């Protein structure tokens, strides 16, 4: 706990960034006007009527920070290559996330605050079950930024072959290719596809 | 029937505890008055206003009781050990269950009573099909409390090997591991790692 | 076409009986009056305000008739036995059908008639895709009445090893049991579990 | 990029035709009154009160145009045959594209324009993830028009065999059921079943 659990939580908060921008687009009660007699009402009621865009904004900066901490593991190391023996695509495991765990929150109505406490508890419970599930690599935000999630079986030049790894890659991979690595956990590594 | 059916119903009522706490949080309609104008309006119309959180409260105590009756399985004789040959982490169930059978109830509006009778009938029909569907081990309330559901293939020192069992383990298991069992049913056993 | 398509349409109309029951429970605005002031409005207004419960009632009688036409095939030719060589329980397809194709109908609001035309078009389009989708045996109404859907490979005494058949059974089956067949199509047969 | 991406975007716009038909049926505020005092309000406010049927109409003609291009990819070539070694039906991967990605759109209320901007962003995001998701052959509009999507492993008479191809076809296929190809990408080809 407290290192692998925090890494998986930082992967999960990245997976909810599309939900936070969806709620910000959905239920922001901004007074969009261009007339002369529609002057500023003040920061007090503008903050008070826009509570859930403010909270989803703070969570969106948290998702941006965790994306930065994900790129910080491909910053440092990774001048070593392996060979893929069996690559099966698992990008659809990202998209079913967007099919199931995000669009019901589009379906709800964020008017009363008690229902918002219920939806926040649903997000927290989905996170706690999602941490310990060995499917935490599913991401709408990562798969939206060109990355593809593959199930590979790498083979090291000197150690041997390790089975059932998950490769987040920037380009397409196939059987008998040459990729780099930067291991997030003992399950997920970022590939780079040496040409 | 009966006893095995009652054990599976007791596993199913445990699977719905998060739904009952979501309905209690969602539609409570309790007077939360910080103002001095709102006094106690009376117990009778407070009970008559809150009908679905009272019923979901009673079902929540039923889920707590069935969790206690699940823990009574591992209270008694569990002092044997086996060896694990396959350890396929089928813990993604209790997350498709959560967002396919518990999340759609959160979007309904629990206002008119015929609609509540329809939702109760949906819960009953989902339960009747879920008893005999070979996937009754999926449990959001169990997977909240650290438990991981594994598809396992055990081997006994004296009898032999038995195929396709389900282990509700407390900690992570792998191939060639020693666990202590307590058999809930002929398909699902509570396992604890021996270390 | 025709006859095989009509049999698959009958199985699909059988698969939608719980939806018609749910709509009849949901949106029937019957005037349940115990008071002495609520007299009869008339049969005309009771019919005109309950149009879609009447339509779902007619479809429920069609589902009952197609259940009768399914049960007609266990009567006439069932004096032969076969042996199951590989049984895998596929009773979860019915529950995924119930949770995915019937539950989202329950959350719609059946008030404006244009929306009702849209939902009827969704039912028709789901049926047209569901006839030819190779998974037409999924059924909430059949799995409610004790039937379990299995994937078996029968062994004939003198004909061969026709594999990949779908067995609707009244009781549990495993490897090496004898079952009485009554073929519906070239894919789905009703077993009987010869003791 | 470009051309392959444009072909996959065309297949995705073909995949969404039933959604545009459903929205046009759902939220068209057309004054369907046969009364004598139901005069024309005017073209301008008829256009302004029906903005999202107009947008979904334009997208429906785009889906019709991309269906025309998919027929143009089979107009020209397609005078060579292969042999099929392993045929597995995958038409259900079409239908799960419906009930998870097109069904929950009709539960939304298309009244306020901010919510419509959110739903359009959801369509765009589902499209961006669905291009690279390796399951882009899923189709409600194609599977409506008799086409079945199979997973085949063709064998050429002179070149050899190729594994894991996806065949869109008009009639039922099996092993040793020679077909004519009209290859769209390196993954999806249109079969014709040379008798």
Swiss-Prot record, chains A, B, C, D:
Record membrane topology: Multi-pass membrane protein
Cell compartment(s), UniProt: Cell inner membrane
Principal place of residence: membrane
Record field: transmembrane: 10-30, 46-66, 117-137
One record GO biological process: defense response to virus
Single GO cellular component term: plasma membrane
InterPro entries associated with the record: KwaA
Keywords, alphabetical: Antiviral defense, Cell inner membrane, Cell membrane, Membrane, Transmembrane, Transmembrane helix
Knockout consequences: Cannot be deleted in a Kiwa-containing strain of E.coli.
Coiled coil (residue ranges): none
Function: Component of antiviral defense system Kiwa, composed of KwaA and KwaB. Expression of Kiwa in E.coli (strain MG1655) confers resistance to phages lambda and SECphi18.
Stated name of the protein: Kiwa protein KwaA
Gene name linked to the record: kwaA
């Amino acid at each position: 706990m407290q290192r692998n659990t925090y890494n998986k939580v930082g992967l999960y908060i990245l997976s909810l960034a599309m939900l936070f921008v969806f709620i910000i687009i959905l239920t922001a009660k901004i007074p969009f006007c261009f007339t002369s007699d529609c002057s500023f009402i003040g920061l007090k009621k503008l903050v008070l009527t826009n509570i859930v865009p403010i909270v989803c904004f703070v969570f969106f900066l948290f998702s941006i920070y965790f994306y930065n901490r994900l790129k910080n593991i491909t910053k440092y190391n990774g001048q070593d290559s392996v060979k893929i023996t069996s690559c099966q695509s698992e990008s659809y495991e990202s998209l079913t996330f967007l099919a199931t765990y995000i669009v019901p929150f589009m379906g709800f109505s964020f008017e009363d605050m008690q229902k918002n406490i219920a939806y926040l508890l649903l997000v927290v419970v989905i996170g706690i079950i999602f941490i310990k599930t060995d499917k935490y690599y599913a991401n709408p935000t990562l798969a939206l930024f060109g990355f593809k999630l593959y199930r590979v079986n790498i083979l090291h030049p000197g150690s041997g072959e390790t089975k059932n790894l998950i490769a987040i890659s920037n380009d397409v991979l196939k059987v008998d290719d040459n990729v780099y690595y930067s291991f997030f956990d003992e399950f997920v590594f970022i590939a780079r596809k040496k040409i």
